[PDB]
Ligand binder design. Structure first.
Ligand code: HEM
Length: 153
């Protein structure tokens, strides 16, 4: 359970993201795909991209980055009271997209890295710890829905 102080730290940096959702989403997906190439293989939509320059030039990848970060922002802004938002996301990622929980750890690391790069003055250690806790809460709650459905592994 995050404290109100931890949520404020999370949402203070998140408000900076919402100034350039698309640039953040590109940086985060690209870092994900470079750091963990097995993730790229889950996107039939993107698996033709073989270089970081190709990734940066894909408007379709930039669109998906906005989709991802818009869904994550709506979850974060519920401060934990996010059951309605997670249900559908867990269900599609477990049963349709077939995304292991570990890959949600990987994209959480990429989000934290990108926020540190773009917002260092609002992403000191206190805020990095709080965002780590927020993303852990996201993964914990998704993992409980995966387990229900027979996908926690
Ligand atoms: C912060 C974590 C994430 C969020 C908030 C998120 C959100 C979304 C949303 C909102 C959609 C479209 C609606 C739906 O299908 O449910 C989507 C699609 C999808 N996501 Fe995620 N996602 C996350 C992480 C991941 C990761 C780590 C992967 C793969 C490694 C992945 C793979 C996919 C795939 C394959 C699609 C369908 C893309 C397509 O072909 O259109 N997601 N995601």
């Amino acid at each position: 359970v995050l404290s109100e102080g931890e949520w404020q730290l999370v949402l203070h940096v998140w408000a900076k993201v919402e100034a350039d959702v698309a640039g953040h989403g590109q940086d985060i997906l690209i870092r994900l795909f470079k750091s963990h190439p097995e993730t790229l293989e889950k996107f039939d939509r993107f698996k033709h991209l073989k270089t970081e320059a190709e990734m940066k030039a894909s408007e379709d990848l930039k669109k998906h980055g906005v989709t991802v970060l818009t869904a994550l922002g709506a979850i974060l802004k519920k401060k934990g009271h996010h059951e309605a938002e997670l249900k559908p996301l867990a269900q599609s990622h477990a049963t349709k997209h077939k995304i292991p929980i570990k890959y949600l750890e990987f994209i959480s690391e990429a989000i934290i890295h990108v926020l540190h790069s773009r917002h260092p003055g609002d992403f000191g250690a206190d805020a990095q710890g709080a965002m780590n806790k927020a993303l852990e809460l996201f993964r914990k709650d998704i993992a409980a829905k995966y387990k229900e459905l027979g996908y926690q592994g």
